[PDB]
Design a protein around this ligand. Structure first.
Ligand SMILES: O=C(O)[C@H]1O[C@@H](O[C@H]2[C@H](O)[C@H](O)[C@@H](O[C@H]3[C@H](O)[C@H](O)[C@H](O)O[C@@H]3C(=O)O)O[C@@H]2C(=O)O)[C@@H](O)[C@@H](O)[C@@H]1O
Ligand SMILES: O=C(O)C1=C[C@H](O)[C@H](O)[C@H](O[C@H]2[C@H](O)[C@H](O)[C@H](O)O[C@@H]2C(=O)O)O1
Length: 231
């Protein structure tokens, strides 16, 4: 039988501050249900160690969505609210099967748009350089679809071992640290000033696959939302 993520101590802090959405944005498990052993092939403990997300289908997801702790409701914060908002993770991105082209593994999202997507991507040109098998950030600086609304950055080539991420938002600015190295330093997010519905996500969100049956798979060794206020 499949082992539940909550059978070990490692992920209990974040499971106390999340709901699981799967296979769409519909609720699959509340925080309480995650803490009490919710399990399936989309969401289980691998190697006794990794919180593993699996999902097939274009635009489908298996993702944790940040919640107020202790059974609270959806959280909502702002890039300019004066608080530092922090998420950390340690992620093993395995080699993906044929048909999977891009998997979003962390997000800053609001009521209506993704401010930040960190995604694995099989192949893409950025700024006239061709890159393969890598980790990318996509930041939105507007709501339109032309290329001027996005800032896209090569963060790192995918490694076989765990890669660590820290995301910080303070005073309308975004910083992304990858394996201890600051790669994105103070990206402007002031377009989003006043939007007070932002929240973190993490897991697997499958983008533009070429087969809807191909299963994306991501393993987390650590994940936390870091409260700079200690309630
Ligand atoms: O690859 C492209 O064709 C363009 O895709 C853009 O990123 C989009 C991404 O592929 C996802 O479709 C999607 O994720 C969010 C949606 O924006 C939407 O509001 C939905 O209701 O919530 C989704 C979520 O994040 O959970 O959104 C991306 C988007 O921002 O439109 C860009 O990478 C673009 O440059 C590219 O040409
Ligand atoms: O485009 C979406 O389907 C969508 C992307 C966001 O990341 C987020 O998952 C959002 O989810 C809402 C949704 O309305 C859902 O059905 C539920 O009632 O609340 C979600 C939420 O904000 O947590 O929709």
């Amino acid at each position: 039988f499949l082992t539940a993520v909550s059978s070990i101590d490692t992920f209990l802090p974040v499971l106390n501050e999340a709901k699981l959405q799967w296979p769409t944005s519909a609720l699959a498990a509340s925080s309480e249900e995650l803490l009490g052993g919710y399990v399936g092939s989309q969401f289980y403990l691998q190697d006794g160690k990794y919180m593993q997300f699996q999902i097939a289908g274009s635009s489908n997801r298996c993702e944790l969505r940040q919640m107020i702790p202790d059974g609270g409701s959806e959280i909502g914060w702002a890039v300019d609210d004066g608080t530092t908002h922090t998420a950390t993770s340690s992620i093993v991105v395995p080699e993906q099967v044929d048909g999977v082209e891009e998997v979003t593994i962390m997000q800053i999202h609001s009521g209506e748009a993704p401010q930040l997507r960190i995604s694995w991507i099989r192949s893409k040109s950025l700024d006239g350089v061709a890159y393969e098998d890598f980790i990318m950030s996509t930041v939105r600086i507007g709501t339109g679809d032309s290329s001027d609304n996005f800032v896209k950055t090569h963060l790192a080539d995918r490694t076989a071992g765990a890669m660590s991420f820290q995301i910080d938002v303070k005073d309308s600015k975004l910083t992304i640290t990858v394996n201890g190295n600051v790669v994105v330093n103070g990206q402007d997010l002031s377009f989003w000033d006043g939007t007070d519905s932002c929240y973190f996500k993490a897991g697997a969100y499958n983008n533009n696959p070429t087969s809807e049956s191909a299963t994306a798979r991501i393993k987390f060794a650590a994940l936390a939302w870091v409260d700079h206020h200690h309630h």
